[PDB]
Design a protein around this nucleic acid. Structure first.
Lengths: 185, 421, 172
RNA sequence: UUUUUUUUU
């Protein structure tokens, strides 16, 4: 508006709720020392999985949501209990979910795996993250659950805060569930 | 046409022909109906996203065609130049002397529709890598046209050298394994872009970015290798065009000549759309191809072969053509031109032009006639029956005595098989 | 906007577990998450949660427990007609078809399974009915809102005089 | 699928 002629309206109305169903599969591993106290550190550490993103664009919101889901329900390995020298955290998930979003329009997907592996160093904590994901659209007529429903929430509190920890701005519509707004980045 | 009546009944019939082949088209018929060469592209994504998509797809080797087309459109758009003359062709006009033009000012742009594929995006791609990326892609297009490992590797090593001399520390993309970009030749917009680039950088050869033309030189004379042969024969013989077209002596290359020489279809205009008829889509089957003019091609290249020509031992040998009749005419013409040298006065000082003093002669025997004219050669050939002279065959054999390289189903092979005997 | 939506409701609740429950707080914690993975009608989602509250108020034992203490088990069943004031806006049309859910609950000390069979559908009748908020047996104290929040249901106890349903973010 | 010098900045 500060200039003239810089688009008008955008009649196509990208700003509107759109639903997207898809199968998801996830597997995550985290390695470090000085074993891992509290959940805020989980978000802080995993937030550096895409420092230099080289993945298939258009899937960034889905990948971020998926990393959040995987970080939510990660189960520590017995070695953490037995030895504290080199703990390890593992996670694995798979299912079919449908997400509402208003980012835009997603092109056709594909059933290809994607691997990411990066080191991290956040203050006292240092180590490695290694994820492997596979998302692909589903054209069936099943009644899948909402992706948010897959979060139990009996650990950690508030979804706006947590969605911001990962770089994700969402909304809290009174009569429904959380809908995406944009990626803060 | 001619009438053929059934004798026993006197009935009237009209024998038609089968059509296993396909019909013929001329460029003039495209500009006689519609006057705009369409070109469809996508412009939704910015330049950096397309750069990332192209670079990463090529590194992995799963790049999409539409993204490459859009990248070439978004890269070759700030290049321009001056303009000397009045460019025009087939009732079209482009600019006027004393202005500036781009590379896509030759074809009309529009909006491609339909869903589009995805890519693998990158967030670190310096701008400096645009100098050579279109060059790399055009070189890939060029090298992906010949199915031969030796030639392919020689051409790709030339391409790597071309990229190196500009942006050394450049590294090869599209690794040596799974082969890509060989299906792109089946697409229509990529070849239109390549042809437009080739024409533009062919007219303005002094441009600083002319090195792109390394990748588009195969696109100019495509599917038109019957005119090239005619010109090469005209140059080797050294005579004018009238004497060359006179020396045919069979109505099979003449049919092709009549098919190739029509009022429209302006030839000899370097700044025209003629050579790029194929890529631009102006014609499906070009009338100057070698699959619809086999007799002309074979006769021309055999005449060239029998006159100590270089580009004669690597031509192909099309089949379904009667070699006995074209071969005899080609041999006769070759002997006629290579057995009598025309000497005479060319420039005369004032009223002192030398006149040939030849009215008394003794050439009533079988010996050859002096000068070069079909009228006096057909007479000598008829008077000496159709049998080639032993001297003619000796000349033919000594003309093809030594030949090092030969390839199966080549005119050189045929000559060494029948004439070297 | 205070919208009064009428419906007939039927509810059947069952809980199975070891370590038989002692305090109502543990039972409420176990039942609050009966919908870990909801695949029912979206537009009826909040209403079902309200009905779960009712089931909590109607926790009962059975002769099975008196027959053996090593298979703790609680039953409950309710049904009738009611209408609810709500400020969720407008609810879609509702059908009369049964719905069922069964989930495992794991809170550490208490572990087992929870089963809920609900059927909520429109009340096309024009006769008056009591308040759905004035239908439970929790005359108890003013901590109805605390119980709802512990479930995760936001209600208002202001001068309106009722416990009207308020909002979502029931997840915490 | 076209093509038909293992010619070509």
């Amino acid at each position: 508006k500060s200039y003239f002629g810089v688009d008008e309206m955008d009649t196509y109305d990208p700003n509107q709720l759109r639903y997207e169903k898809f199968f998801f599969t996830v597997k995550m591993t985290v390695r470090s020392n000085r074993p891992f106290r509290t959940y805020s550190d989980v978000a802080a550490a995993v937030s550096h999985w895409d420092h230099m993103y080289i993945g298939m664009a258009g899937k960034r919101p889905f990948y971020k949501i998926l990393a959040f889901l995987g970080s939510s329900n990660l189960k520590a390995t017995p070695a953490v209990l037995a030895d504290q020298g080199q703990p390890e955290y593992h996670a694995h998930c798979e299912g079919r979910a449908y997400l509402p979003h208003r980012m835009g329009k997603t092109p056709p997907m594909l059933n290809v795996p994607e691997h990411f592996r990066r080191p991290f160093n956040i203050g006292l904590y240092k180590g490695t993250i290694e994820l492997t994901m596979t998302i692909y659209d589903d054209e069936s007529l099943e009644a899948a659950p909402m992706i948010w429903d897959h979060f139990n929430s009996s650990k950690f509190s508030d979804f706006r805060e947590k969605a911001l920890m990962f770089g994700l701005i969402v909304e809290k519509k009174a009569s429904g569930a959380w809908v995406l707004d944009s990626i803060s980045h | 046409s001619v009438t053929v009546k059934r004798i026993i009944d006197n009935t009237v019939i009209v024998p038609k022909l089968p059509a296993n082949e396909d019909p013929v088209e001329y460029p003039a018929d495209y500009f006689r109906k519609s006057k705009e060469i369409p070109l469809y592209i996508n412009t939704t994504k910015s330049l950096s996203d397309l750069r990332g998509y192209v670079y990463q797809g090529l590194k992995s080797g799963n790049v999409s065609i539409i993204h490459v087309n859009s990248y070439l459109y978004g890269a070759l758009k700030d290049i321009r130049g001056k303009l000397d003359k009045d460019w025009s062709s087939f009732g079209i006009n482009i600019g006027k002397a004393g202005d500036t033009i781009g590379i896509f000012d030759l074809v009309s742009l529009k909006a491609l529709d339909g869903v589009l594929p995805d890519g693998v995006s990158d967030a670190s791609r310096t701008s400096a890598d645009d100098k050579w990326l279109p060059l790399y892609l055009l070189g890939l297009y060029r090298v992906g046209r010949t199915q031969m490992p030796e030639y392919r590797k020689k051409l790709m090593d030339g391409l790597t050298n071309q990229c190196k001399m500009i942006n050394e520390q450049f590294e090869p993309l599209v690794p040596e394994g799974r082969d890509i970009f060989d299906v792109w030749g089946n697409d229509s917009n990529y070849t239109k872009i390549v042809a437009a680039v080739d024409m533009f950088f062919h007219m303005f050869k002094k441009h600083e970015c002319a090195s792109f033309r390394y990748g588009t030189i195969v696109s100019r004379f495509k599917d038109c290798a019957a005119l090239a042969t005619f010109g090469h024969l005209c140059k080797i013989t050294g005579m004018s065009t009238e004497d060359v077209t006179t020396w045919i002596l069979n109505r099979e290359v003449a049919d092709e000549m009549v098919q190739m020489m029509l009022p429209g279809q302006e030839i000899d205009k370097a700044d025209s759309y003629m050579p790029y008829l194929i890529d631009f889509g102006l014609s499906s089957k070009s009338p100057y191809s070698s699959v619809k003019n086999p007799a002309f091609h074979f006769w021309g290249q055999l005449t060239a072969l029998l006159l100590r020509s270089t580009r004669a031992r690597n031509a192909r040998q099309p089949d379904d053509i009667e070699y006995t009749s074209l071969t005899t005419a080609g041999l006769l013409y070759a002997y006629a031109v290579g057995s009598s040298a025309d000497l005479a006065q060319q420039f005369c000082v004032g009223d002192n032009k030398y006149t040939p003093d030849d009215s008394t002669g003794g050439l009533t025997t079988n010996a050859p006639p002096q000068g070069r004219d079909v009228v006096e050669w057909l007479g000598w050939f008829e008077d000496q029956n159709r049998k080639p002279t032993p001297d003619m065959m000796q000349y033919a054999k000594r003309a093809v005595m030594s030949l090092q390289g030969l390839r199966e189903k080549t005119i050189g092979k045929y000559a060494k098989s029948e004439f070297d005997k």
